[PDB]
Design an enzyme around this catalytic site. Structure first.
Site, PDB file in Angstrom:
ATOM      1  N   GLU A   1      18.579  -9.982   5.926  1.00 49.05           N
ATOM      2  CA  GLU A   1      17.217  -9.705   5.458  1.00 49.05           C
ATOM      3  C   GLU A   1      16.176 -10.519   6.260  1.00 49.05           C
ATOM      4  O   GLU A   1      14.977 -10.452   5.971  1.00 49.05           O
ATOM      5  CB  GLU A   1      17.092  -9.975   3.946  1.00 49.05           C
TER       6      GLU A   1
ATOM      7  N   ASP B   1       7.844  -4.061   3.461  1.00 55.36           N
ATOM      8  CA  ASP B   1       9.242  -3.687   3.694  1.00 55.36           C
ATOM      9  C   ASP B   1       9.352  -2.191   4.088  1.00 55.36           C
ATOM     10  O   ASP B   1       8.349  -1.468   4.073  1.00 55.36           O
ATOM     11  CB  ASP B   1      10.123  -4.009   2.454  1.00 55.36           C
TER      12      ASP B   1
ATOM     13  N   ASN C   1      35.685   2.843   0.651  1.00 53.56           N
ATOM     14  CA  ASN C   1      34.802   3.367  -0.406  1.00 53.56           C
ATOM     15  C   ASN C   1      33.329   3.057  -0.116  1.00 53.56           C
ATOM     16  O   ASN C   1      32.472   3.925  -0.291  1.00 53.56           O
ATOM     17  CB  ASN C   1      35.193   2.787  -1.776  1.00 53.56           C
TER      18      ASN C   1
END
Ligand SMILES: CCCCCCc1cccc(NC(=O)[C@H](N)CCP(=O)(O)O)c1
Ligand SMILES: *[C@@H]1O[C@H](CO)[C@@H](O)[C@H](O)[C@H]1NC(C)=O
Length: 455
Positions: free
Chosen positions: A219, A228, A340
């Site tokens: 980040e 953002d 997954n």
């Protein structure tokens, strides 16, 4: 009456402590003890030579920590030499020594001990400098380490003894002054106590630095307020100031969070203090969910932070929305949960960020973030076990010595048959070379990489 280089002093000192008449006990078994311990010593000499050779041959081992490991290997090398010379000048030959030849005999064991203590410290402080950041200053420290050891080891020779003060003579070391043993025992327990408190600080600060540097890439970091990719103002490490599209509204919430007028710019420390607030909140968000808290309890520090990173971006219900992955994580099947998450929206939105987080769950190491600062985790964990073995081997002698300071002569029976404590402390000189190849694969790889006879 003669020079205090007469053998009669040694007789009077072992006579007062009660060792002269019991010297002819198990003398036949003493020969079997010495010859066997001399073989164990020669094996310790090679062990430490092999440690000194690997560092001298491997280029990647020319780092400051390894120089202190080599200096520690030197302490344990000369310890084995001193104890080989001790066994030969101990027993029946003890009375055939002059007090000078005696103060030098047991003095050698103290110098080797003092050197090991300072050497350990030298490795302890080095680990605290690796996280938060010069070859000539290293050899000065190694020289100073031996100079202080030669003073703190041989000062009983130049004065601090008990030759005419039998009332102050320790029974386990007849010519040593009781106060000097107490002085050595307290200085070395105080120094060993400094290491333990330092390693608890090092392991905790690195734990907080690893979660910081992990999110310093995923980040990023900012001093000024920025919008953002979603459409809201943000600062530092993904700290969402407001959902409102007002620049001054972000300045309002930012000044409330810090407690001063910033105008948009915040300090690096102010960003970190605001970052801990976002981590703590994300951590609390895990310990309040029936599917996140069990997983966090089954994970390690590296994979725990990996789950924290996931919560830091989406949230509580966000990570709880991947039950199929979490179930495979709690079952310790990392490769199954890796697939997954690779097909999910999280991997389709930010592929380069999720890749590192998934790699952390799979590998269970900081190799996806830190290149060489991740290898130091195994290189530090092994050194903590070195100290843990050292305090387990010397503490029985240290306790016994402390008991000798607070006990009348020919009273405490434990102090007589105390040859076991002295041997356990000697054996430790050959446990460090063994602990390197067992608890460090990077060191063990270099050790086998060394099979050249002439080399
Ligand atoms: C403060 C800590 C004490 C320093 C330890 C020095 C040391 C290490 C290992 C052994 C010894 N001493 C001995 O084993 C002695 N030979 C004991 C037998 P004797 O000398 O005959 O009393 C002394
Ligand atoms: C010293 O040893 C002698 C024998 O060598 C013995 O007679 C004497 O009692 C001992 N001295 C003390 C003070 O115990």
């Amino acid at each position: 009456v003669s020079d205090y280089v007469n053998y009669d002093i040694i007789v009077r000192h072992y006579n007062y402590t009660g060792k002269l008449n019991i010297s002819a006990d198990k003398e036949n078994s003493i020969k079997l003890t010495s010859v066997v311990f001399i073989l164990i010593c020669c094996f310790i000499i090679l062990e430490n030579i092999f440690v000194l050779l690997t560092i001298w041959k491997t280029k990647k081992f020319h780092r400051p920590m390894y120089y202190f490991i080599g200096n520690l290997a030197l302490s344990d090398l000369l310890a084995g030499v001193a104890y080989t010379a001790n066994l030969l000048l101990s027993g029946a030959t003890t009375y055939k020594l002059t007090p000078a030849q005696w103060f030098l005999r047991e003095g050698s064991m103290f110098v080797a001990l003092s050197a090991s203590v300072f050497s350990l410290l030298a490795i302890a402080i080095e680990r605290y400098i690796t996280m938060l950041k010069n070859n000539f200053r290293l050899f000065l420290l190694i020289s100073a380490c031996w100079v202080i050891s030669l003073i703190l080891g041989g000062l009983p020779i130049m004065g601090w003894n008990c030759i005419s003060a039998l009332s102050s003579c320790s029974t386990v070391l007849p010519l040593y002054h009781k106060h000097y043993i107490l002085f050595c025992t307290t200085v070395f327990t105080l120094l060993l106590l400094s290491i333990v408190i330092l390693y608890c600080r090092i392991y905790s600060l690195v734990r907080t630095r690893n979660i910081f540097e992990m999110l310093r890439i995923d980040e990023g970091l900012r001093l000024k307020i920025y919008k953002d990719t979603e459409g809201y103002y943000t600062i530092g490490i993904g700290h969402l100031l407001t959902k409102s599209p007002s620049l001054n509204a972000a300045k309002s919430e930012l000044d409330k969070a810090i407690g001063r007028n910033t105008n948009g710019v915040i300090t690096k420390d102010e960003a970190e203090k605001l970052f801990n607030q976002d981590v703590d909140a994300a951590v609390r968000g895990i310990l309040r969910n029936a599917k996140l808290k069990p997983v966090y309890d089954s994970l390690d520090a590296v994979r725990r932070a990996a789950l924290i990173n996931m919560v830091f971006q989406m949230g509580e219900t966000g990570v709880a929305g991947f039950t199929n992955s979490l179930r495979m994580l709690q079952q310790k099947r990392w490769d199954e949960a890796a697939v997954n998450l690779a097909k999910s929206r999280w991997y389709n939105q930010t592929p380069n960020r999720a890749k590192r987080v998934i790699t952390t769950f799979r590998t269970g190491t900081w190799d996806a973030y830190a290149s060489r600062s991740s290898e130091n985790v195994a290189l530090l964990k092994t050194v903590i076990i070195v100290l843990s073995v050292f305090i387990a081997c010397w503490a029985p002698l240290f306790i016994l010595l402390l008991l000798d300071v607070g006990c009348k002569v020919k009273t405490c029976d434990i102090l007589f048959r105390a040859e076991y404590f002295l041997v356990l402390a000697v054996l430790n000189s050959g446990t460090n070379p063994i602990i390197y190849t067992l608890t460090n694969k990077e060191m063990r790889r270099a050790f086998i990489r060394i099979m050249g006879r002439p080399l």
